[PDB]
Amino acid sequence: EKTEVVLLACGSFNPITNMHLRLFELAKDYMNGTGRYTVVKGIISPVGDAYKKKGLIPAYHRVIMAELATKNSKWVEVDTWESLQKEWKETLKVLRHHQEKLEAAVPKVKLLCGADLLESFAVPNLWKSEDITQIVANYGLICVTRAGNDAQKFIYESDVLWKHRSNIHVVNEWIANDISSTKIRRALRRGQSIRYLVPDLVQEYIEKHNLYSSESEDRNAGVILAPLQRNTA
Amino acid sequence: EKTEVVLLACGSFNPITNMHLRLFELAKDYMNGTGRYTVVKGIISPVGDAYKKKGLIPAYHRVIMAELATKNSKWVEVDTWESLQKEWKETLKVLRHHQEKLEAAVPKVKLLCGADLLESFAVPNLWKSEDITQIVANYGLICVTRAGNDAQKFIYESDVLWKHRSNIHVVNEWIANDISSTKIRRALRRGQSIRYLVPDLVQEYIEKHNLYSSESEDRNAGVILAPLQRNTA
Amino acid sequence: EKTEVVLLACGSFNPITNMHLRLFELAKDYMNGTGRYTVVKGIISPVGDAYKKKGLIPAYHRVIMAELATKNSKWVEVDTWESLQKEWKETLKVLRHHQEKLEAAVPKVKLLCGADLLESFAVPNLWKSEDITQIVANYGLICVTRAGNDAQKFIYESDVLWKHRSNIHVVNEWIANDISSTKIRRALRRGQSIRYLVPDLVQEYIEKHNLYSSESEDRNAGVILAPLQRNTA
Amino acid sequence: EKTEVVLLACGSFNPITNMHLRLFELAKDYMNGTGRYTVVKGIISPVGDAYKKKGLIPAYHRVIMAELATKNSKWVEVDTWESLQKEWKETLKVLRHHQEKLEAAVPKVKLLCGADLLESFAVPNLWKSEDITQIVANYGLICVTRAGNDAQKFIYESDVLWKHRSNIHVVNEWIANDISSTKIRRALRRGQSIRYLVPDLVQEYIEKHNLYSSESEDRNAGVILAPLQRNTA
Amino acid sequence: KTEVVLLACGSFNPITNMHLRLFELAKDYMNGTGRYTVVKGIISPVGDAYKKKGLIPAYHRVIMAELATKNSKWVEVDTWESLQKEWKETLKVLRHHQEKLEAVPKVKLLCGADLLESFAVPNLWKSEDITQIVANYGLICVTRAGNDAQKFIYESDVLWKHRSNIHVVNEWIANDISSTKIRRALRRGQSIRYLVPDLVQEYIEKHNLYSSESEDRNAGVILAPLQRNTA
Amino acid sequence: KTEVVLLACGSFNPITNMHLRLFELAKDYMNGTGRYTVVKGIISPVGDAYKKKGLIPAYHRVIMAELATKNSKWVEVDTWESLQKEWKETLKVLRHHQEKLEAAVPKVKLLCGADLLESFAVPNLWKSEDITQIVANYGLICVTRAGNDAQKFIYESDVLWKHRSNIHVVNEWIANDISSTKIRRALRRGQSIRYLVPDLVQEYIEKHNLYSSESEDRNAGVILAPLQRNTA
Ligand SMILES: NC(=O)c1csc([C@@H]2O[C@H](COP(=O)(O)CP(=O)(O)OC[C@H]3O[C@@H](n4cnc5c(N)ncnc54)[C@H](O)[C@@H]3O)[C@@H](O)[C@H]2O)n1
Ligand SMILES: NC(=O)c1csc([C@@H]2O[C@H](COP(=O)(O)CP(=O)(O)OC[C@H]3O[C@@H](n4cnc5c(N)ncnc54)[C@H](O)[C@@H]3O)[C@@H](O)[C@H]2O)n1
Ligand SMILES: NC(=O)c1csc([C@@H]2O[C@H](COP(=O)(O)CP(=O)(O)OC[C@H]3O[C@@H](n4cnc5c(N)ncnc54)[C@H](O)[C@@H]3O)[C@@H](O)[C@H]2O)n1
Ligand SMILES: NC(=O)c1csc([C@@H]2O[C@H](COP(=O)(O)CP(=O)(O)OC[C@H]3O[C@@H](n4cnc5c(N)ncnc54)[C@H](O)[C@@H]3O)[C@@H](O)[C@H]2O)n1
Ligand SMILES: NC(=O)c1csc([C@@H]2O[C@H](COP(=O)(O)CP(=O)(O)OC[C@H]3O[C@@H](n4cnc5c(N)ncnc54)[C@H](O)[C@@H]3O)[C@@H](O)[C@H]2O)n1
Ligand SMILES: NC(=O)c1csc([C@@H]2O[C@H](COP(=O)(O)CP(=O)(O)OC[C@H]3O[C@@H](n4cnc5c(N)ncnc54)[C@H](O)[C@@H]3O)[C@@H](O)[C@H]2O)n1
């Protein structure tokens, strides 16, 4: 009766934090709460290094931190397909990849994300307009956020999003958590504690290997983010 | 050279969450960061049932969760003295109890709190005025908050806090993660997940004893908060 | 397939304005837009004089203004049942009266209101707690507003509303209005035009009978609102 | 004794809405209210197609809607001069034309506008600086807005406007209902009701001719707004 | 062109650059409409009978006001209200000054939005006093929160009805040197140089006028207006 | 207890009660920490080579600064910077004054508002090595009403955060925003600026009719010296 859903979260996870994990908890409670869906699985998909984002450390490490973070998760797992791509892959292709994989009574894959990601649809050249359309019309978004009217507004201001609003589920986050990866790296560079902001095993892995520093933050400096490069050219 | 410091936090811890542990980490980085102090220990002291606060579940439950929460901490521990007293004890007595206990070169106990508690100083009949003075003049306050200017202002607006401002340290939390006990109890009453908001051992203990509910929320309904009863009469 | 719905707006309509009529258009588009409902009728039900609200003019006139306002509406009508009650009737009973009437495959009546009304649920004694419960659980509320996180938040802070959140639909209204009856009456007493804020026929009816003045505003001065008097005593 | 005044509003009126008409009502109450003026007429002057604004439908439709909107008004009418010119006309010329036309103890024509228009004086190349000076110095400006202190600040920040401020009247709208033309088109594209947001005859005219759509919104896409083209090149 | 006399009542406990600033702002504004001509400014310190918490001796407040205006061509201090052994309503102070001028310029009350909004504080003003002040004299209300004052006026049928006699003067230079904050600064021994005129600063320092003790004067005592009007 | 000298660089166009208030606030703060003793305050107006739009002749600015502090027991004016032919970096001004004191030696600290601090992010306005040296070897006493604005600006910058022990954020609780810009605007419109600046500065401006639409246009279109030098 209810539609089975698989939550897919793409992102750089640089590094993964408690907020990324909360995203799944919140979305699951929300989708299951509607009485219309059954969340069967969650997937964390770290982006490959060809994404070229500034300060992005090696994919293998981000994949290991995510596995450590979901070690004790009964329903959330890590998928490495994206991390292994020599050519950065569009989110639309990742969704397609996962939907097809499930096909091989079939659960539907929905993109799990936050407000920022939804709003980035308006950054020039970051997304191919046709991609935005197929993502909302054929897959769906589960957008979690502390600024719900911020997202509702953004959806209202765009004809394509408004038209497919039935597939964009905005999930309010009442507990104010804004544990960004960027503030974690900043904390690490300064020798500050990040305990209780990221799983214990992740924090331990990061400190053991000094993964984050001024130097790592410099990776890809002056380089153009893959999507931008490819959509402008 | 450096003044050694023991950070003490009184509160209901109903229940303890990642945020209370996070307060300790933050306060310690800040105090050690000044170069003028060395934080040798943190103490979590749950309030005894005589506090009579609404929704306050039994102290043994709150103490065990706080103990489970700090089990894997190397410097934060729980002290049960206050929870075991038959009569509710003023924060100043708790600070004094602990300061004396250390005398037996001697570390200074300092109160660790959020802006809310600092602000509660103005609540009529909540604090004896000589208490506030002794606390800030003889012990000290380490006030952690996301609303820095709020606290700075509160201090600026009181002749006494301002006079002793050198003994009051406002610590800014740039990684906003406000996991209140109230929001946790609300989530629990609603069957929502609190995974990653509190230590796994705390969650497991909450689950096993089905701790928070509409009925628990009702405890002490209509009773008058202990310090209010005492200071009024 | 789709659930048929009848929207019922209770209120003083003192006087009815363009925003009251907008409520129906918005709600209808929203409900039919979900693809899960079919709005078959709108009902404006002006409150009887026994409600005793300060400044409330005779019900006969409020009913006439509502009739004139919906003269050209194909689906929104006026029901006088409430206006004729010698004893003020609780909204729950009005809802019940209309649902029973429909039972003579049966459409469901839902209360159409704005966020102000939803929030009035917290005014001490204004609403019987069990009434609120039965309204959200057995009928439903379609709440329109320019402050949706206003309403969303109000629902999140109440266990009973949250529990029945599936029966409460928040409809964002992006075209920022704010045309309260109270400001229309203030305008009239000041001899200001209210054309284009209310239907032409309503404006003309008001002008012809000098309905609103300082005298009309004093009606019921010093009298307690019916629900308050009945729930307190 | 009292200076007679003719309020003139230039604009695209694409489409006209209840808000554009309320604007005249408010300004009239204000100007007459001061005891120093007598408003004898209001003129809506739709901009011609040569303005080249994106999404601007043909002037005949906009003029007709505007006439339908004012058919039932006793003092506000539509003037077509501006729209009949082959070349887009500077607002100052439109004002001059009308002042001259009245000289055929003579009423003063004053520009009637919202805050948006006022603030557009800062847009690079949108207005020749001598035009601004002449408009405010020789005719006058009646600025109706819900952001009164906003308009006041904009005037304070400009030497030109401040110097002639006695000829600028900021009228506060306390009964806000910002029904922008942009939001009306947005609603039309989406099949949403606009009943009670525009005069019934406008609404019916739009509906009979299916006026707004994705296609109309594209008109002049990529074409440079006439004033910009003129004052730049 | 109507001649206007700006009358400012209040504690001036102590007078600050902001109070003086009020006159300059109002003058430029009224004179700027072309419909008026400001001829004089009168600072009138309230008498000690007002009984407001922290109010120091009128002798000092009068003296500081005089020092503040010593070099003022058009603003002066009127010690009448101060020498009143019985606290006088603002209306009566306006009358006193109107009647004094006829022995003809119109006296208008100069003030801030606080004072205007205080019309809503229970029993602080006799409603007929409000009506007569706005109706028969006029308010020149200076403020940084202009919409604060406009909304307050819009919300009251009485003030609205007399809106033409209530001139709201915006002040765009965000400065709010309240007396309260000057006292606070002095109790804590911080400098207030450049927030009040040099002579008032020097006067205050030389006599250690403000303190925890001076702040406690009249503690627990009801405000004159509140007493008279409630009983 | 470390002896300190507060040095304020800026256009001072014109100086107002607020710039003066800035010194009083910082000195009270610094002395109140019980770790410092503020011995002197120096106001140093930028030279005309700054080329900032609306910047009137440096000589007038210096004189108003002198009149403003004529009665100041501890704050004085220094024309060295205004007399240089080429616009001088703040780092060089600080250095020049620290070297002048060396002739138990007092430390010169830059006194500024949040704007200047935040200006560190303006592209090409400051050499990054210059920022590091100013904060590491001299220090910043930043006065402001938006304390969290500044605290946050510091928190977001690794170099500033790193040297935060040398950056003191002093909260101004008595809002006192008398910007030079608003003073010039008021004067152009003939409004009174009495009690916004010291009486003597006010009298001087009046006597010389200093600010006008015309002066406000000085250097119109000219690129600010730092931006010019750092882009080339
Ligand atoms: N297909 C395309 O054209 C395209 C353009 S960008 C893009 C993908 O978008 C991603 C960008 O990742 P990133 O590093 O910028 C983001 P990051 O990895 O930090 O975020 C992962 C997810 O968590 C969300 N999130 C983060 N913090 C919060 C919070 N505090 N509250 C609620 N939600 C939160 C983010 O919006 C995101 O959806 C990449 O995976 C990239 O491949 N696809
Ligand atoms: N001595 C007295 O007169 C007196 C009056 S009240 C009082 C004591 O004060 C306590 C009040 O406890 P409670 O249950 O209300 C508080 P709770 O137990 O929730 O808080 C514990 C501590 O965390 C702080 N804190 C909480 N959330 C945050 C946050 N999100 N960010 C930063 N800091 C935060 C609080 O200020 C407090 O210091 C009691 O234990 C009581 O004994 N003493
Ligand atoms: N059953 C009870 O215990 C109970 C308590 S009060 C109550 C009923 O509640 C009603 C209160 O009526 P009233 O005069 O206070 C309200 P009014 O008649 O002014 O409003 C009618 C409806 O329009 C809504 N509304 C008005 N303006 C807007 C706007 N600008 N934007 C969005 N929505 C708007 C209001 O929320 C309301 O739902 C009465 O009918 C009363 O009988 N029932
Ligand atoms: N002369 C020039 O150099 C010059 C440059 S632009 C210009 C003219 O200015 C015009 C602007 O056209 P447009 O498309 O923006 C007209 P639009 O139809 O959008 O607006 C008409 C008027 O209503 C006002 N208004 C709108 N909404 C509100 C509201 N919600 N509350 C209060 N007031 C409101 C607007 O500011 C405007 O004055 C054009 O007609 C153009 O010819 N003249
Ligand atoms: N007649 C009555 O019923 C009545 C009630 S209160 C009253 C009189 O009202 C006065 C209240 O004096 P007080 O001590 O409370 C006020 P204070 O003396 O501090 O203020 C004097 C004036 O300056 C204004 N002002 C203050 N700060 C600002 C600012 N930052 N910006 C712009 N304007 C500002 C105030 O509103 C006031 O008009 C007294 O003189 C009292 O006699 N009369
Ligand atoms: N060295 C470099 O690379 C570099 C780039 S810009 C620069 C210097 O920075 C200066 C900029 O001067 P300017 O004319 O832009 C600023 P202005 O002269 O107006 O300011 C003087 C001082 O007052 C502070 N201040 C201003 N308003 C307030 C307020 N309201 N509250 C608290 N404090 C305040 C300012 O930050 C500044 O430190 C110049 O002297 C210039 O030489 N150095």
Question: Do A214 and F161 lie within an 8 Å CB cutoff?
Answer: no
Q: Is F182 annotated to bind ligand? A: yes
Phi, psi of D40 (to 5 degrees): -100, -10
> Which amino acid, residue C26?
L
Ligand 5 pocket list (CB less than 6 A): E 8-12, 18-19, 22, 46, 50, 52, 89-91, 111-112, 114-115, 124-125, 129, 142-143, 176, 178-179, 225
Selected residue of F189, F213, F214 to mutate for chain D interface (largest D Cβ count, 10 A): F189
Q: Which residues of D touch E33 (CB under 8 A)?
A: 166
Residues near C4 by Cβ (< 8 Å), separated by ≥ 6? C37, C38, C39, C40, C106, C107, C108
Instruction: Give contacts of A164 with chain D, Cβ < 8 Å.
Output: none
**Residues β-bridged to residue F5:** F40, F108
Judge contact between F91 and F132, C-beta under 8 A: no
Do E130 and E158 form a contact (C-beta atoms < 8 A)?
Answer: yes
Are F177 and E177 in contact (CB < 8 Å)?
no
The CB density around residue E208, as the number of other CB atoms within 10 Å, is 10
Strands (E), A55-174: 76-78, 108-114, 141-145, 168-172
Q: Is A16 in the pocket of ligand 1 (CB under 6 A)?
A: no
Tell me D137's DSSP state: I
User: Which H or E element spans position D159?
Assistant: helix D159-163
Token pair of A124 as six digits: 């020039």
Provide the sign of the torsion angle of the four alpha carbons F28, F30, F35, F38, taken in this order. negative
| Residue among E12, E98, E8, E15 nearest E48 (CA) | E12
- Using the Cβ of A190 and the Cβ atoms of chain F, whether some distance falls under 8 Å is answered with yes
Q: Could you count the other beta carbons within 10 Å of the beta carbon of residue B22?
A: 22
Residues of F with Cβ-Cβ distance to B34 under 8 angstroms: 165
φ, ψ for residue B49, nearest 5 deg: -55, -20
Chain B residues inside the 8 Å CB shell of C162: 190
Does D20 show up as a binding residue in the annotation?
yes
Cross-strand pairs, A109: A6
CB atoms within 10 A of CB C225: 18
Q: Contact C4/C185 with Cβ under 8 angstroms? A: no
Pick among D7, D195, D202 to test the C interface (most C CBs inside 10 A)? D195
How many angstroms separate the CA atoms of E180 and E13, rounded? 8
Contact A152 C148 (CB under 8 A): yes
Which of A:162-181 have CB within 8 Å of C? 166, 172, 174
Q: Which residue of F has its CA nearest to B154?
A: F173
CB distance B127 to ligand 2 below 6 Å? yes
In this structure, what are the phi and psi dihedrals at residue F50, rounded to the nearest 5 degrees? -65, -40
Which ligand lies nearest to the CA atom of residue C55 in the structure? Answer: 3
The last residues before gaps in chain A (C-N over 2.5 Å) are 104
Question: How many other CB atoms sit within 10 Å of the CB of residue A41?
Answer: 17
Eight-state DSSP code of residue B165: G
d(CA C214, CA C168): 38
How was this structure obtained? Answer: X-ray
Residues F87 and F51: beta-carbon distance below 8 Å: yes
Token reading at E100: 């004094």
Per the CB < 8 A criterion, the answer to whether C49 and C61 are in contact is: no
- C190–E contact, CB cutoff 8 A: yes
Closest CA to C194 of A49, D106, B43, C202: C202
Query: 10 Å Cβ neighbour count for A72?
Result: 11
Please report the domains of chain E, with CATH numbers, ordered by start residue. 1-231 (3.40.50.620)
DSSP structure string for F94-162: HHHHHHHH---PPEEEEEEEHHHHHGGGSTTTS-HHHHHHHHHHT-EEEEES-HHHHHHHHHT-HHHHH
What number does the ligand 3 atom closest to the CA of C182 have? 19
Positive or negative torsion for Cα A158, A164, A167, A171: positive
* Angle between helix F58-69 and helix F199-208 axes, rounded to 10 deg: 150
Under DSSP, is residue A106 helix (H, G, I), strand (E, B) or coil?
coil
Q: Is the dihedral of CA C117, C120, C125, C128 positive or negative?
A: positive
Q: How far apart are CA B27 and CA B33, in angstroms?
A: 10
Quickly list H helices, E74-223: 90-101, 113-117, 127-136, 146-155, 157-161, 179-187, 198-207, 212-215
User: CA geometry: angle at C20 spanning C14 and C23, to 5°?
Assistant: 155
Of C145, C194, C185, nearest in space to C169 by CA: C145
Separation of alpha carbons B152 and B148, rounded Å: 6
The resolution, in Å, is 2.3
Place of tokens 């001028």: E101
- Please count the residues of chain C: 233
Check pocket membership of F150 for ligand 6, CB cut-off 6 A: no
Q: A129 — contact with chain F (CB < 8 Å)?
A: no
Interchain contact, A149 vs C172, CB within 8 Å: yes
Euclidean distance between CA atoms B156 and B159, whole angstroms: 7
At residue D52, φ and ψ (nearest 5 deg) are 65, 20
Is E156's Cβ below 8 Å from some Cβ in D? no
List the beta bridge partners of residue E196.
E193
Q: Which residues pair with B43 in a beta bridge?
A: B8, B77
Can you tell me the distance from the alpha carbon of B19 to that of B13, in angstroms, rounded to the nearest whole number? 11
Nearest C-alpha of chain D: how many angstroms from C196? 6
Query: What tokens were used for F183?
Result: 């003073």
Q: Which atom of ligand 2 is found nearest the CA of B53? A: 14
Residue D140 is labelled as binding a ligand: no
Distance CA A114, CA A116 (A): 6
Chain C residues with CB under 8 Å of D177 CB are 18-19, 176-179, 197
The torsion region of residue B121 among left (phi > 0), alpha (psi -120 to 50) and beta comes to: alpha
DSSP state for residue B138 in the 8-state scheme: I
Task: For CA atoms D64, D70, D74, D79, give the dihedral sign.
Answer: negative
Instruction: Return the ligand 4 atom nearest residue D20 CA.
Output: 23
Q: How many CB atoms lie within 10 A of CB C34?
A: 13
CA of C182 to the centre of ligand 3 (A): 12
- E157 to chain D, any CB pair closer than 8 A? The answer is no
Is the distance from CB of A33 to CB of C156 less than 8 angstroms? no
For Cα atoms E117, E121, E127, give the angle at the middle one, nearest 5 degrees. Answer: 90
Cβ of residue F141 lying under 6 Å from some atom of ligand 6: no
How far, in Å, CA of A99 to CA of A163, rounded? 23
Which residue has a Cα nearest atom 33 of ligand 2?
A: B114
DSSP assignment of chain C equals -PEEEEEEEEE--TT--HHHHHHHHHHHHHHHHTSSEEEEEEEEEEPPGGG--TT---HHHHHHHHHHHTTT-SSEEE--TGGG-SS---HHHHHHHHHHHHT----EEEEEEEHHHHHGGGSTTTS-HHHHHHIIIII-EEEEES-HHHHHHHHHT-HHHHHTGGGEEEEE--S-----HHHHHHHHHTT---BTTB-HHHHHHHHHHT--SHHHHTTTTT---HHHHHHH-
Distances (CA, A) of F147 to A224, E181, F173: 35, 18, 10
Contact F87, F38 (CB under 8 A): no
Q: Is F76 helix (H, G, I), strand (E, B) or coil?
A: strand
Long-range CB pairs of D32-38, under 8 A, 24+ apart, other chains included: D34/E164, D35/D2, D35/E164, D36/D2, D36/D3, D37/D2, D37/D3, D37/D4, D37/D5, D38/D2, D38/D3, D38/D4, D38/D5
| Rounded-to-integer distance, Cα D70 and Cα D77, Å | 6
CA C132 to chain centre: 15
What Rg, from alpha-carbon coordinates, does chain C have? 17
